[PDB]
Amino acid sequence: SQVFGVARIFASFNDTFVHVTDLSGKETIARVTGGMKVKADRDESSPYAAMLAAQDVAAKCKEVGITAVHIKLRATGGTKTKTPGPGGQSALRALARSGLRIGRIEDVTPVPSDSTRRKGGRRGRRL
Amino acid sequence: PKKRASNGRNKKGRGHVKPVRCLNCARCVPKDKAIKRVTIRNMVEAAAVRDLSEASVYAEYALPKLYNKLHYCVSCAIHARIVRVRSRTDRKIRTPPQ
Amino acid sequence: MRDKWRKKRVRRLKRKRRKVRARSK
Amino acid sequence: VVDPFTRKDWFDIKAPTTFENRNVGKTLINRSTGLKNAADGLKGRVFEVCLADLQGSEDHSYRKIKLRVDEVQGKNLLTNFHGLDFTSDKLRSLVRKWQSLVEANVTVKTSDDYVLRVFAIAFTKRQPNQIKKTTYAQSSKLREVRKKMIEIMQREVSNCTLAQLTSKLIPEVIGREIEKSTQTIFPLQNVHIRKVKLLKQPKFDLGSLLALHG
Amino acid sequence: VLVQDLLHPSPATEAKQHKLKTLVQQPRSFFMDVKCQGCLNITTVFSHAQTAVTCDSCSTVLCTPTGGKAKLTEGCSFRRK
RNA sequence: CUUGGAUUUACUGAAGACUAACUACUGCGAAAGCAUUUACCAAGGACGUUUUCAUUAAUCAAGAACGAAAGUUAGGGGAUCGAAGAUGAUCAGAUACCGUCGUAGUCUUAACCAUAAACUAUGCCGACUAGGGAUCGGUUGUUGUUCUUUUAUUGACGCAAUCGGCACCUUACGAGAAAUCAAAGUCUUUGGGUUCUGGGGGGAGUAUGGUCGCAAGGCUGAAACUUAAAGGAAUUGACGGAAG
Ligand SMILES: NC[C@@H]1O[C@H](O[C@H]2[C@@H](O)[C@H](O[C@@H]3[C@@H](O)[C@H](N)C[C@H](N)[C@H]3O[C@H]3O[C@H](CO)[C@@H](O)[C@H](O)[C@H]3N)O[C@@H]2CO)[C@H](N)[C@@H](O)[C@@H]1O
Ligand SMILES: [Mg+2]
Ligand SMILES: [Mg+2]
Ligand SMILES: [Mg+2]
Ligand SMILES: [Mg+2]
Ligand SMILES: [Mg+2]
Ligand SMILES: [Mg+2]
Ligand SMILES: [Mg+2]
Ligand SMILES: [Mg+2]
């Protein structure tokens, strides 16, 4: 039917990555971050910047031949937060409303089997 | 004086319990003491579950859930309104809010 | 002052006296 | 300055005959030149595709297969089985509280000398008339269950080749027979082969692979 | 209940009590006559036996010890003396 | 830090840690503590016992074994975090809180140290005094239940008893200054056995002597002088850059 890439979306709390590869992931087709759409550091991870990022990502994809994508959402993971950033849901919604068709959706947040020590110290970050 | 009969934790018949880091501030908190919430949230907000389903290449594809278990220390949880200050008599109630 | 730090202060001062007493050893 | 997408050539990926819909999709690479062939730099790639797509049924939606390309025949990529894994959300949906989780793994080689590690998972099953909140199995029984898992993975892999074993995984023969073998030990649910890893491959035999492609 | 016949407990509730908590402690165990299926030979066996008792005629185990009462093997019938 | 391609993506490799989810008012251990699998080594409580010995015991100055973390000595390792140190911000000032690097340390092998809000702020042994429902381990009688395998001698679940545990709920015969307490009750109606500690607040765990330690320090431990209060629990109010 359609020709699938894989939209590997990394939505942290400081930025939002929209990166579409082939199925293998060794070939990158389009990579637009929320920081290429705004000039303020404070909203690099905003839903607005992620939606704009997906439209440019979506815009670049049609001219290469990608008509549909699979979604691999991840949060920062590791020792840091496992919840996705605010930009991951809007960039995903933008892709569906941009004419790209969506296949499988998966969370690929890296999750440790206990892991190494987390930054911040014993008492946490005191504010 | 003594504020709680459970000492604000869940350690009885035990010497030591391994710590956990608060999700929000990374403070070391004992596992029995940590305020724990298990969240199973829909991955797509209810506004967007329709248009992405129209855009789906699969007929009758069920959207996956987002599974997460969150750990908070006492300062973060009180601040984030996950738990609230209760009256002296209302503190004892330990059933989940309905 | 805090009891732990008041205690730390005397420890540094007890240590100094012992070193001071060592002169006449 | 160059639009590097002008130099890309598309190839079609074909899955092994163990699956139904062998037409997985399309990939690309820098076009083959005189200095560097596209073929040698194109082989060894691994694609992770949901098993439900490879079989049509949506019942296999929670398993994902790695297909590894090691031969190109014009614009077609002839792939082989590279591994098994569960989706993160499906695995997270089985690990509930008030039940016991039991896991086992074993390293075993197939008939054609494919060394694999297979990870098995199971949970205690709550009986229909049970009243108490939790369903915990005593630690001695879990040791017997873990041991029983291992001898089935060892037995059902070393007696067969990787291609037949791949055909064994789709209907979960090993997970259901392990469930059958532990009935007298403890009632179990969601007995799954949740992950398969290729560690070592035999010396490559193109003839054996072409037979797996028609 | 303030007034009660402590000297004459109801025998039903006396039997549910722990074996050391009756008026006079009395064991609840007993001795048995074991008929193996193979032959006919009276063999006296303790109910809570700690030994894999074997009958003299054939060196066949009559019972296997457990945490509590011994479990008689199949074909062996017991009658309490 | 980044057109010397950073961040990102897929595959592969190497190092050390750490054992997520399952994980609980659940288990074990003298305490400190203990959570991947399997093997081996020697332990252990409880239960069951118409086994055995017969007072062998309880608690214990002195004296022994163990004793989180940090710290010390000497090797090895040093991924991640990270005292010290350096820095970018903030501020009136900030040696800090926040951010970026980071050395000891964090790990391990041989030795040291012997301290924690080492807490249940609650000594141990023995007896008695009240109801209820859960739960872990063992033992003993019984099912409209599922399953081995088709059923038993499978296992699970369900229903009853019991002993031991980890706890929880109610009540107050009773205690207490109250908070509260099934022990913190059976204490002016004052005596079951036994070990330790305190005698208004400071000065002060200071000085001195002794002893242990490589050191840091540990154990033991005053006095002069000063003072009308210091303190506990609860009530009303006032206030809060806490919640509703
Ligand atoms: N009933 C509460 C307590 O039970 C204790 O004894 C109970 C236990 O010995 C035993 O309880 C078992 C327990 O071993 C294990 N966790 C399994 C089982 N769920 C528990 O038993 C439970 O069984 C059913 C409910 O399932 C009830 O009818 C029963 O009362 C309840 N105790 O059954 C006894 C029933 O009373 C003591 N009698 C006492 O501390 C107190 O009564
Ligand atoms: Mg604050
Ligand atoms: Mg207070
Ligand atoms: Mg204990
Ligand atoms: Mg402790
Ligand atoms: Mg003190
Ligand atoms: Mg684990
Ligand atoms: Mg347990
Ligand atoms: Mg025990």
Ligand SMILES: [Mg+2]
């Ligand atoms: Mg130490």
Ligand SMILES: [Mg+2]
């Ligand atoms: Mg150390």
Ligand SMILES: [Mg+2]
């Ligand atoms: Mg290091």
Ligand SMILES: [Mg+2]
């Ligand atoms: Mg760092």
Ligand SMILES: [Mg+2]
């Ligand atoms: Mg500094």
Ligand SMILES: [Mg+2]
């Ligand atoms: Mg002390």
Ligand SMILES: [Mg+2]
């Ligand atoms: Mg404590």
Ligand SMILES: [Mg+2]
């Ligand atoms: Mg105590």
Ligand SMILES: [Mg+2]
């Ligand atoms: Mg108490």
Ligand SMILES: [Mg+2]
């Ligand atoms: Mg003390």
Ligand SMILES: [Mg+2]
């Ligand atoms: Mg029981």
Ligand SMILES: [Mg+2]
């Ligand atoms: Mg109460």
Ligand SMILES: [Mg+2]
């Ligand atoms: Mg008192």
Ligand SMILES: [Mg+2]
């Ligand atoms: Mg005094």
Ligand SMILES: [Mg+2]
């Ligand atoms: Mg003085």
Ligand SMILES: [Mg+2]
């Ligand atoms: Mg007060």
